[PDB]
């Protein structure tokens, strides 16, 4: 016989039992999301116990099968995922120190309370307190004081845990065939054992700096425009040659620029698209929202979304009788049951993230025929890629005019398209160099060829040249400010929000060369076109079972990144940026410190 088919049958049995166990776990997770009670806490404790035990025991049992002896690369990659020992390669004392330090660090991050200004009866958290002093606050001084106090109170509690975290992750990953934990983040973004279309881990690194130096000048021009407009919004503290403070961008970490839209408005007479007026005049509630969603599904070319959502889920607030959270999660039960957690209201951002969540549900049903090791994207960025593609192609009001959602009184002039393109650029393109240097910096931290106790000064001085942001006051090495992030404290793969940011444009070009759509790429309607829908479907139904590079050729046609569609997506905005900040200074200077 051959041990290959023995490993295949072990994979099949493990996949079936994991389907059942993850079905129970996902049902428990959805019931906890809709209701946070004592019995739901017990349900999650038991689900975590059974899931961790089953996963670790099957991973332990999988080590007796040799890995690279199978010519079938599907079950070979299934073994590669299954025979990942992970934290099993080292002993229990380092693991329990890892659990203590990490759970204390997580519960310090989550309810980190800034309590320096005024009386201590208030301590400003993220959503109740920081969101009303960072997203909208017309005082530079109070923003500076609150952000500095927040950074201090995060740093002096997060740093001694994070240094041992970095050391522990490096020595964990050095035994699991990774050069560091950054290499573990690039381990999923690697193709080995498949001939021809090879992808490696440093290849994604050089792709990342390649995309950075490619999309540098668009960020130069939008940085010049946003600096010129923040001369108007925040004068007397920022020089036209120097950089910008990071506590005025609309994002406390310095990441996004989405709420920095009214202060940096292109045209006062023309805002962005707001079709919500006819919705609130239309009594367009969440049920009709999802009916229009399934009509848009049929119009694009996707199949109509199943009734299994409808009797299993809700779309509005349930009141205070049950503890549901309005977090947009597209839960899959793993056994043909789809549920959507979203408080779908009359709000344009809620409708666009409903497009996002139902694109996630569409990609969830796209890999439906695959087993439990393969019911995913080939990387984590594909789900958000499908969601943001759906959101961006749904953000063109021409289809709303065609179907009657938007009345024909509105016209799409150049002003509204500049507003929409600046909204999209400040939303997700404005964090392309931010995500770039945070990913690069966390790589060159976790790789560990660098000195240990100088991270903060170097990190606060290298941000002046990539995005072009300056700390108004110097920050010493007792701080731990980048670990104040949900993707660093919880320590998730932040490359996912980088590379997806190009996905939602490049495949967009792939969905407009098949839609027979011309002109600017942002005005592209994938609806009323079966060819673009089926070309999206071609990448959709592949999923995890193939290496992601292969999917990248059958949707784009390269082993590497189709970067240049970003200019097609933003050509009128780039022209307006050239015409606007030509007289003002374009660039930044490190030495200017407020």
């Amino acid at each position: 016989s051959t041990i290959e088919e023995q490993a295949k049958t072990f994979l099949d049995k493990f996949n079936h039992e994991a389907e059942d166990l993850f079905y129970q776990s996902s049902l428990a997770s959805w019931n906890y999301n809709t209701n946070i009670t004592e019995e739901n806490v017990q349900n999650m404790n038991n689900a975590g116990d059974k899931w961790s035990a089953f996963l670790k025991e099957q991973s332990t049992l999988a080590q007796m099968y040799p890995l690279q002896e199978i010519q079938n690369l599907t079950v070979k990659l299934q073994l590669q995922a299954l025979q990942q020992n992970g934290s099993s390669v080292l002993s229990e004392d380092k693991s329990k120190r890892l659990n203590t330090i990490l759970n204390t660090m997580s519960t310090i991050y989550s309810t980190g309370k800034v309590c320096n200004p005024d009386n201590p009866q208030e301590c400003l958290l993220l959503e109740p307190g920081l969101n009303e002093i960072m997203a909208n606050s017309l005082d530079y001084n109070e923003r500076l004081w609150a952000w500095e106090s927040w950074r201090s109170e995060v740093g002096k509690q997060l740093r001694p845990l994070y240094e041992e975290y970095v050391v522990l992750k490096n020595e964990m990953a050095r035994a699991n065939h990774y050069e560091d934990y950054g290499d573990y983040w690039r381990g999923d973004y690697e193709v080995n054992g498949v001939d021809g279309y090879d992808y490696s881990r440093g290849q994604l690194i050089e792709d990342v700096e390649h995309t950075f130096e490619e999309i540098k000048p668009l960020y130069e021009h939008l940085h010049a425009y946003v600096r010129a407009k923040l001369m108007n919004a925040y004068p007397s503290y920022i020089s036209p040659i120097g950089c910008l403070p990071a506590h005025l961008l609309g994002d406390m970490w310095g990441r996004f620029w989405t709420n920095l839209y009214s202060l940096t408005v292109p045209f006062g007479q023309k805002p962005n698209i707001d079709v919500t007026d006819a919705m609130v005049d239309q009594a367009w509630d969440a049920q009709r929202i999802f009916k229009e969603a399934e009509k848009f599904f049929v119009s694009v070319g996707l199949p109509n979304m199943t009734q299994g959502f409808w009797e299993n889920s809700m779309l509005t607030d349930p009141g205070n009788v049950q503890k549901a959270v309005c977090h947009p999660t597209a839960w899959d039960l793993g056994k043909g049951d789809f549920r959507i957690l979203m408080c779908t209201k009359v709000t344009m951002d809620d409708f666009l993230t409903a497009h996002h969540e139902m694109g996630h549900i569409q990609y969830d049903m796209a890999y439906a025929a695959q087993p439990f090791l393969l019911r995913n994207g080939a990387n984590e960025g594909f789900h958000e890629a499908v969601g943001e593609i759906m959101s961006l192609s749904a953000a063109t009001p021409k289809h709303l005019k065609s179907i009657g959602l938007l009345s024909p009184d509105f016209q799409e002039d150049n002003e509204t398209e500049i507003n929409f393109l600046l909204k999209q650029a400040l939303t997700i393109v404005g964090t392309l160099p931010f995500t770039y240097m945070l990913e690069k910096w966390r790589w060159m931290v976790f790789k560990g060829e660098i000195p240990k106790d100088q991270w903060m000064k170097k990190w606060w001085e290298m941000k002046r040249e990539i995005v072009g942001v300056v700390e108004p006051v110097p920050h010493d090495e007792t701080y731990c400010d980048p670990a104040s992030l949900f993707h660093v404290s919880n320590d998730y793969s932040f490359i996912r929000y980088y590379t997806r940011t190009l996905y939602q444009f490049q495949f967009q070009e792939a969905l407009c060369q098949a839609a027979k759509h011309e002109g600017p790429l942002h005005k592209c309607d994938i609806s009323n076109s079966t060819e673009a829908g089926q070309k999206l479907f071609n990448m959709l139904r592949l999923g995890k079972s193939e290496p992601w590079t292969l999917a990248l050729e059958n949707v784009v046609g390269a082993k590497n990144m189709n970067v240049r569609p970003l200019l097609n997506y933003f050509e009128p905005l780039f022209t307006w940026l050239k015409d606007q900040n030509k007289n003002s200074f374009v660039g930044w200077s490190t030495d200017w410190s407020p």
Binding site: E5, T9, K335, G336
Partner: protein, 98 residues
Amino acid sequence: KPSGNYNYLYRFLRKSKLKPFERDISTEIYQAGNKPCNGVAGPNCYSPLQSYGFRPTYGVGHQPYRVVVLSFELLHAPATVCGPKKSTNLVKNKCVNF
């Protein structure tokens, strides 16, 4: 039931190609190879019995479906189970066929 109707089972392995017109009632273990079961083994015997669950929160491809397969026989004997329903009432003193 929400607990799950796990009583129903199926075989994902078999000794050979299952022939038509015969029901292999026994679910005896189909051995993979290269190693003895040494009785009934977890990692290296591969018992073919697997459950369904069939909870009400399953999917359309996972739905419990009730199946009946009716198969006639062409063996050397004519028909016994037919529908002889003709059912016309009566007639009399009329030039008629019957």
